[PDB]
Enzyme design. Structure first.
Site, short mmCIF file in Angstrom:
data_model
loop_
_atom_site.label_atom_id
_atom_site.label_comp_id
_atom_site.label_asym_id
_atom_site.label_seq_id
_atom_site.Cartn_x
_atom_site.Cartn_y
_atom_site.Cartn_z
N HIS A 79 0.80 -1.21 0.00
CA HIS A 79 0.00 0.00 0.00
C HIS A 79 0.84 1.27 0.00
O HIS A 79 0.30 2.36 -0.22
CB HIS A 79 -1.09 -0.05 1.08
CG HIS A 79 -0.67 0.13 2.50
ND1 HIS A 79 -0.06 1.26 3.00
CD2 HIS A 79 -0.88 -0.67 3.55
CE1 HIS A 79 0.11 1.12 4.31
NE2 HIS A 79 -0.39 -0.04 4.67
N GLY A 100 1.95 6.18 10.71
CA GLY A 100 3.36 6.07 10.38
C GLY A 100 3.97 4.73 10.78
O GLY A 100 5.14 4.48 10.49
N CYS A 154 3.09 1.63 9.77
CA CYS A 154 3.00 0.53 8.82
C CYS A 154 4.39 0.01 8.47
O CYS A 154 5.35 0.78 8.34
CB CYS A 154 2.26 0.93 7.56
SG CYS A 154 0.55 1.44 7.87
C1 LIG Z 1 -2.12 6.96 1.58
C2 LIG Z 1 -2.75 5.61 1.59
N1 LIG Z 1 -2.44 4.90 2.83
C3 LIG Z 1 -3.28 4.82 3.86
O1 LIG Z 1 -4.41 5.28 3.86
C4 LIG Z 1 -2.73 4.16 5.12
C5 LIG Z 1 -2.27 5.25 6.08
C6 LIG Z 1 -1.28 4.82 7.15
N2 LIG Z 1 -1.89 4.14 8.30
C7 LIG Z 1 -1.12 4.10 9.40
O2 LIG Z 1 0.03 4.50 9.40
C8 LIG Z 1 -1.65 3.59 10.70
C9 LIG Z 1 -1.23 2.34 11.15
N3 LIG Z 1 -1.62 1.78 12.30
C10 LIG Z 1 -2.46 2.47 13.07
C11 LIG Z 1 -2.94 3.73 12.71
S1 LIG Z 1 -4.02 4.74 13.60
C12 LIG Z 1 -3.95 5.95 12.37
C13 LIG Z 1 -3.14 5.62 11.34
C14 LIG Z 1 -2.54 4.33 11.51
C15 LIG Z 1 -3.22 3.54 8.15
C16 LIG Z 1 -3.26 2.58 6.98
N4 LIG Z 1 -3.67 3.20 5.70
C17 LIG Z 1 -4.18 2.19 4.69
C18 LIG Z 1 -5.45 1.49 5.08
C19 LIG Z 1 -6.32 2.14 5.96
C20 LIG Z 1 -7.51 1.56 6.36
C21 LIG Z 1 -7.83 0.32 5.88
BR1 LIG Z 1 -9.45 -0.49 6.43
C22 LIG Z 1 -7.00 -0.36 5.00
C23 LIG Z 1 -5.80 0.22 4.59
C24 LIG Z 1 -4.93 -0.56 3.63
C25 LIG Z 1 -4.07 -1.62 4.30
#
Ligand SMILES: CCNC(=O)[C@H]1CCN(C(=O)c2cncc3sccc23)CCN1Cc1ccc(Br)cc1CC
Ligand SMILES: CCNC(=O)[C@H]1CCN(C(=O)c2cncc3sccc23)CCN1Cc1ccc(Br)cc1CC
Ligand SMILES: [Cl-]
Ligand code: NA
Lengths: 305, 306
Positions: free
Chosen positions: A41, A143, A145
């Protein structure tokens, strides 16, 4: 004596964490040999994330679109490909700190240590279990991931989890290091929900043994039960079935403490039916289910890495 | 989201752990630059341990009576001295893996990560708090002496604890890295008992703020309290006094959540009176007191889930 939620020493994994940037996105990668692994992603814009065609999105990317930093050192990307939901970036330098390692896919109920990272920098370490519903109850912010989960045996790091997202209920989902999701989840921003979770019975029993080893014994009783009768009780209280394999795995603790597994099951049955009557076990007012039998034996015998 | 007892990554400390042997005793040491730090009780036999005369025991030792092993490599001891209850062994090699570090003596209520080690080898890492009675509630077996506690705020390792013994009640006692015991304890196998422990009130309040940040408000109420009335009540449940310093330290969490500190105090008073009524807070059925205000800011989102 004493019994604590204990993570593995994280040093061998710290030396593998890097920062991966694609366009406006920065997240974490795992650098082993001459490959960096991260969530696929990373290649998605917010708009792409709603309905990504990863094959089509990746074909539009070249090596130069991926910036990889190990501390203050830039690693040059010389190839890129996907395996399931993981992106593999081939780099021009083998990690000199690569530990002996394997990739392993774990089963629900198994525990592992999480090294939470941000911007390629390790921030914290804690223990998690893979829940029966294939989520983990982690602690992760924006951040995080590409943070990883692992176990150690002697000198070998077994990587079992890479972090991909948080679900609406605040629990966490991710893949093995071959990019296969744990649980019925997809790497798309669409409505997804964890199934109803259950309690990991074999782990609760392990923790009761830990309690006895550490001198906490008030819940022991004269009774025993059968596997069949106990499983009727487990089902009533949203506990996972106990199998003969579970009984076998607990055999050491039975022998050490003089409490057969079905004896301890009679204790657990009574706790489920009656509560703790204002008492605690190993300082908890709840029945803890994120220690495996192996975790108890490891901690109680001072195994090192 | 989520909230866990979260340790610092242990790698910077792992690279400093060594094994120290004197006679039949082996325990752990901490190798920083060209010095190895360990408990001075390494020089005691079982016979020595009731009323050791450490000066008299130490004068009888040569440098070569101390064996120091870093992994598979023997380090040569070229000097020794005692500082309070720690032995300092000068070695012929500076540790190439020495991190940026400092020594800090902490106060009761402060938290740190422990790297439990045996025979110079790390076993595991977990969080501990310095209890009000100057003990810690760890997980330590025979062979764990010389294991250390530390924080790693901002890339520098602050060493704050070295493990010396388990007390009869199953809790743990040790020193700062200058060899000064936390609490009234001594490195002798004489009758000593920890004072009755109390709950770290400021930390419970911090954790309630963490629960609000993470989206839960069920335990709040419409009431407030004075600081003095709060302390009069909380002391009846064996809670430590809350000071104005504690109130000040909670200011940032108060600002982030919009809940005045004394209003959160009123919530805590009601929780002590009522219990949870079958609910949990951040997955716990008890009031947690081993997260500091700083720990909450470290771990939680800067944005409250409203
Ligand atoms: C730019 C496009 N990327 C996104 O949007 C990333 C953004 C980064 N993320 C994080 O870093 C994060 C991690 N762990 C906890 C938290 S709490 C707030 C943030 C986080 C959240 C994950 N999403 C993708 C995403 C989101 C939701 C779903 Br369902 C699936 C998916 C696909 C797997
Ligand atoms: C040979 C002479 N040295 C001893 O006897 C060492 C033996 C090693 N120890 C440990 O490794 C250990 C650590 N942490 C937890 C546990 S549980 C069982 C064992 C341990 C226990 C500490 N004692 C000394 C000791 C003991 C009690 C008291 Br009071 C004071 C002191 C003086 C400070
Ligand atoms: Cl402090
Ligand atoms: Na029984």
């Amino acid at each position: 004596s004493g019994f604590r939620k204990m993570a593995f020493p994280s040093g061998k994994v710290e030396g593998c964490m890097v920062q991966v940037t694609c366009g406006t996105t920065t997240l974490n990668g795992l650098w082993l040999d001459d490959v960096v692994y991260c969530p696929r992603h990373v290649i998605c814009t917010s708009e792409d994330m709603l309905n990504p065609n990863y094959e089509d999105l990746l074909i539009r990317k070249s090596n130069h679109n991926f910036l990889v930093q190990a501390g203050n050192v830039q690693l040059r990307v010389i190839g890129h490909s996907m395996q399931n939901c993981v992106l593999k970036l081939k780099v021009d330098t083998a990690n000199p700190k690569t530990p002996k390692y394997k990739f392993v896919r774990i089963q629900p109920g198994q525990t592992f240590s999480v090294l939470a990272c941000y911007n390629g920098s390790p921030s914290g370490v804690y223990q998690c279990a893979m829940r029966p519903n294939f989520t983990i109850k982690g602690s992760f912010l924006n951040g995080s991931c590409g943070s990883v989960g692992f176990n150690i045996d002697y000198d070998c790091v077994s990587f079992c989890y890479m972090h991909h997202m948080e679900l609406p209920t605040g629990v966490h989902a991710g893949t093995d290091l071959e990019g296969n999701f744990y649980g019925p989840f997809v790497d798309r921003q669409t409505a997804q929900a964890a199934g109803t979770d259950t309690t990991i019975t074999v782990n609760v029993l392990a923790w009761l043994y830990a309690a006895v080893i550490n001198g906490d014994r008030w819940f022991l009783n004269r009774f025993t039960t059968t596997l069949n009768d106990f499983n009727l009780v487990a089902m009533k209280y949203n506990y996972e079935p106990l199998t003969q394999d579970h009984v076998d795995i607990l055999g050491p603790l039975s022998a050490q403490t003089g409490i057969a597994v079905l004896d301890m099951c009679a204790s657990l049955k009574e706790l489920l039916q009656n509560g703790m009557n204002g008492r605690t076990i190993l300082g908890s007012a709840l029945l803890e289910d994120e220690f495996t039998p192996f975790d108890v034996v490891r901690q109680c015998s001072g195994v090192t890495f």
